[PDB]
Amino acid sequence: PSEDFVVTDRGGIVENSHRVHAAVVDAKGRLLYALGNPTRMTLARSAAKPAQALAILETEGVAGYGFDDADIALMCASHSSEDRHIARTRAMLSKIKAEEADLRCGGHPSLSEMVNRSWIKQDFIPTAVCSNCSGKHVGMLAGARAIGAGTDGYHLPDHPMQGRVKRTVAELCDLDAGDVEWGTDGCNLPTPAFPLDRLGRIYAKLASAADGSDAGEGQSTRCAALAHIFRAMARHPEMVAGEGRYCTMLMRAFDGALVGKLGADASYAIGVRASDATRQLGTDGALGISVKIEDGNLEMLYAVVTELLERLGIGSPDVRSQLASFHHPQRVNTMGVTTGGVSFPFKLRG
Amino acid sequence: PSEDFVVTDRGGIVENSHRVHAAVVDAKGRLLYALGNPTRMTLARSAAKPAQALAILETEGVAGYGFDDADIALMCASHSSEDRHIARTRAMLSKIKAEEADLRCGGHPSLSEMVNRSWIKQDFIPTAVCSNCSGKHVGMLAGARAIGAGTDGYHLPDHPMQGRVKRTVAELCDLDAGDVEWGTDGCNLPTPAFPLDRLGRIYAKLASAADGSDAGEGQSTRCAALAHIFRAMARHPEMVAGEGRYCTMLMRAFDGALVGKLGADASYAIGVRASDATRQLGTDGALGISVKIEDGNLEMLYAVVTELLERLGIGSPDVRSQLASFHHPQRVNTMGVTTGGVSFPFKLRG
Ligand SMILES: [Zn+2]
Ligand SMILES: [Zn+2]
């Protein structure tokens, strides 16, 4: 096994070290570059949300509800529970004539410290429409209603909406169903685990579909729906996360060149449209990147993901400098003195 | 290298894994048991506070200020900034005729979520007197004043109070000065790094001194002051951390049998008085334990420390059941469904 780490220091003395796993793949999933174990069996968590949004959009009758691109971005979101996220959740419930009591997700403290601070100040108790996954849950309810399934158990494995998700995830990964494992997420849905490179593969396919659409190429229904998802995420990145959030700031900086999505417990996935940068990396099409920090540290994840974009030449120094606060996280003590930093003793291998 | 981990799962699928280092030492620092690398060079951070309290108590003239056992517990503390912590900081400043403006530490969000909630509700901005290190800083101010040194720079490495700290830390570790490295902490004091087993050695010497004092043995002023520090921490565990904090709950459960202290970025140190448990572990005196979680995760630290006490037979099932919430942290989702767990595949070696 390779020894790929992100390391924090205090005055040059090792504080913490964190093992890094990464895969960089082409549009067919061929491995181009790796850190750590690029095939590590990994819980995709919320980084599977674009695959789940594809299952929702490929459910016949869902188009009749009139979900717009910001609604689709919400289906793809781990949102901050800003007022705009909660309002959009309730508007999406209205489009399908369902209620908050139909949701099978629960409230939680906001993923945004600033939102959560304002909640704590007002003694706000979050409810199901406040879930960071509320968009995905409304989409799954929409799919259940559309096929005339019945809604009470839309979240259970035996429900056709979860059968459709499970098949769709295996298909995008190019895996047999038995090579995908399932647990239960914080939002109370089935959540998949598969080799980390296949999370890269999903995002390479999303960006590849965007390339095919933009170029006016004939597309399958699946390619057209993947291109729609890419467009929705890139056009409404504030729905995918929120103000100050990595995914939002990343996708704003890149202005359509890529989409990126957080997985809880420090996974990350990026889908990169074909560019001079992807060609210099040795592929003629789109690219996928997937990352896992073995110990689950989010601050380290955003630092490593930003470092990998710099290493791979994706964007310009100017575009990437919008993410400087995440790339080289502040180590300023209570008296304003910088006490250390973050280092990246890992080596991309081809 | 040994492969000693604590692991979290979702539905039996690996989520995160965390590398554990631990040393179990006798009263002289002889290694009895280990996990990972027991000599890992480690920033002791707040777990060095008892060594710093010894430097303070050994400073000529400090005895004249009349610091009591709760004051000494606060010198040893990473407190929650409860009102009683702030009050005792102010009382200690008054004993040395100093003001809050003399402190060279800064305010920070409370180490207690409940305290920080009350602060957020009242728009409270924490100041120097609120620092989790405020007791250590008052003690260092006391030392500087007591020997007629300048007070303005009591926190600077060239100040005689910090020369006393540096020498004292190396002496308790049985190390030459050059074998201890120094950085700057969050509170803006010099902070040491030394092999992890020597953190265990410090706490074994604390517990050994307590045993010597209790038995009415003639003691040096250093051994008597180590005994006093142990007794202060054991008698005032609420000063060392606060309500609901691991160190307070651990030391209350053990009712004098041991002292325990958190280091920032997930170190831990325990000093165990001679007992039936220490004798079953193959030593005739007191014992020291030191732990580091390589990636810095606090929840995993408390889980591991509790599991290690169970494996070492320290306490009874009844004593250790007070720590159940830390030993096997809850993995219950937003809908009340248990989605995962914490496992300890590490193996103690002799
Ligand atoms: Zn979810
Ligand atoms: Zn401190």
Give chain B positions within 8 Å (CB) of A340: 183
Q: Cβ A193–B105 below 8 Å, yes or no?
A: no
CB contact burial B163-194 (16+ within 10 A = b; e otherwise):
ebbbebbbebbebeeeebbbbbbbbbbbbbbb
**Residues of chain A neighbouring B104 (CB-CB closer than 8 A):** 335
| Any domain includes A279 | yes
Resolution (angstroms) stands at 1.6
CA B189 remoteness from chain centre:
16
Beta strands B267-272 and A287-293 are: unpaired
DSSP-based three-state secondary structure for B341: strand
Distance A231 CA to ligand 1 centre (A): 21
Residue among B146, B104, B148 nearest B127 (CA)? B104
- Residues B113, B168 within the same domain: yes
State in Å, rounded, how far the first CA of chain B is from the last one.
15
- Cα distances (angstroms) measured from residue B320 to each of A248, A318, B254, B266, B340: 45, 55, 9, 20, 22
Residue after which a domain boundary falls, among B173, B194, B215: B194
State the count of interchain CB pairs (< 8 A) between A and B: 128
- Do B262 and B311 belong to one domain? yes
Statement to judge: residues B22 and B131 lie in one domain: no
| B163, B231: one domain | no
**Could you write out the DSSP letters of every residue in A211-276?**
HHHHTT----HHHHHHHHHHHHHHH-HHHHS-TT-HHHHHHHHHTTSEEEEEETTTEEEEEE-S-H
Q: Within chain B, where are the H helices?
A: 49-57, 69-75, 83-95, 113-121, 134-146, 160-173, 196-214, 221-235, 237-240, 246-254, 276-280, 298-312, 317-321, 324-327
Same domain for A213 and A171? no
Range of B166's domain? 55-194
The answer to whether the Cβ–Cβ distance between A16 and B131 falls below 8 Å is no
> In angstroms, what separates the C-alpha of A314 from chain B's closest C-alpha?
28
Say if A73 falls within a structural domain. Answer: yes
Contact A183 B13 (CB under 8 A): yes
Distance of CA A26 to the CA centre of its chain: 18
Pick out the residues of the known binding site of B: 133, 136, 185, 187
List CB-based neighbours of ion ligand 1 within 5 Å: A 133, 185, 187
Q: How far is B30 from chain A (nearest CA, A)?
A: 25
Residues of A in contact with B8 (CB under 8 A): 265, 296
Closest-CA residue of A relative to B126 is A334
Extract the tokens encoding A12: 């040059």
- Judge contact between B224 and B212, C-beta under 8 A: no
CB A78 within 8 A of CB A133: yes
Q: With respect to residue B286, please indicate whether it lies within any of the assigned structural domains.
A: yes
DSSP-assigned letter for residue B237: H
**Does residue B334 share a domain with residue B217?**
yes
Torsion angle, alpha carbons of B244, B248, B250, B253, to 10: -90
User: Domain ends where: B158, B174, B194?
Assistant: B194
Residue pair A18/A293 in contact by the 8 Å Cβ criterion: yes
Query: What are the tokens at A256?
Result: 């359509």
Task: Name the residue type at position A204.
Answer: A
Known binding site for Zn(2+): residues of A? 133, 136, 185, 187
B111-118: long-range contacts, CB 8 A cutoff, minimum separation 24: B111/B78, B111/B79, B111/B80, B111/B81, B111/B241, B111/B242, B111/B245, B112/B80, B112/B81, B112/B82, B112/B242, B112/B243, B112/B244, B112/B245, B114/B243, B114/B244, B115/B80, B115/B81, B115/B82, B115/B242, B117/A120
Looking at the fold, whether B336 and B205 belong to one and the same domain comes out as yes
| Residue A316 contacts B, CB cutoff 8 Å | no
Cβ pair A187:B337 closer than 8 A: no
Q: How many domains does chain A have?
A: 2
Residue B191 CA to ligand 2 centre (angstroms)? 8
Q: Is A350 a domain residue?
A: no
Residue A348 lies in a domain: no
End residue of a domain, out of B178, B194, B210: B194
With respect to residue B325, please indicate whether it lies within any of the assigned structural domains: yes
β-pair partners for B16: B8
Longest pairwise C-alpha distance within chain A:
63
Provide the 10 A C-beta neighbour count for residue B114: 13
- A37 and A93 in a single domain? The answer is no
Residue A233 belongs to some domain of the structure:
yes
Interface of A with B in 295-314 (CB under 8 A): 295-297
The answer to whether the CB atoms of B121 and A121 lie below 8 A apart is: yes
First-residue to last-residue Cα distance in chain A = 15
Question: Residue B118 in contact with residue B152, Cβ under 8 Å?
Answer: no
Is B333 in Cβ contact with A106 (below 8 Å)? Answer: yes
DSSP string covering A13-75, please?
EEEEEEEEEEEEEETT--EEEEES-TT-EEE-GGGGHHHHHHHHHTSTTGGGG---HHHHHHH
Percentage helix, strand, coil, to 5, in chain B? Answer: 45, 20, 35
DSSP character for B285? Answer: S
Instruction: Inform me whether the C-beta atom of residue A157 falls under 8 Å from chain B C-beta atoms.
Output: no
Residue A260 has phi, psi (to 5 degrees) of: -140, 150
Nearest-CA distance B152 → chain A (Å)? 14
State which H helix or E strand residue A160 sits in.
Answer: helix A160-173
Closest to B110 measured CA to CA, from B122, B126, B121: B126
Ligand 2 centroid – CA B281 distance (Å): 33
Return binding residues of B for Zn(2+): 133, 136, 185, 187
Are A83 and A170 in the same domain? yes
Residue B215 touches chain A, beta carbons under 8 Å: no
Tokens of B89: 């900081």
State how far the Cα of A38 lies from the Cα of A4, in Å rounded to an integer.
11
Using a CB–CB cutoff of 8 Å, tell me whether A345 touches chain B.
no
CA distance B25 to B287: 6
Return d(Cα A186, Cα A138) in angstroms, integer: 16
Would you say residue A172 lies in a domain?
Answer: yes
Do B98 and B141 contact (CB within 8 A), yes or no? yes
Asked if residue A51 and residue A24 are part of one domain, the reply reads no
Residue B185 shares a structural domain with residue B309: no
Cβ–Cβ contact A125 with B under 8 A: no
From CA B40, how far away is CA B37, in angstroms rounded? 5
Residues A109/A140, Cβ–Cβ less than 8 Å: no
Same domain flag for B264 and B237? yes
* Chain-centre distance for alpha carbon A314: 18
Name the residue among A75, A67, A54, A61 with its Cα closest to residue A94: A67
A294 in contact with B, Cβ within 8 Å = yes
Q: B197: closest CA among B74, B69, B41?
A: B41
Whether B184 contacts chain A with CB within 8 A: yes
Residue A1 touches chain B, beta carbons under 8 Å: no
Pairing status of strand B13-26 against strand B287-293: antiparallel
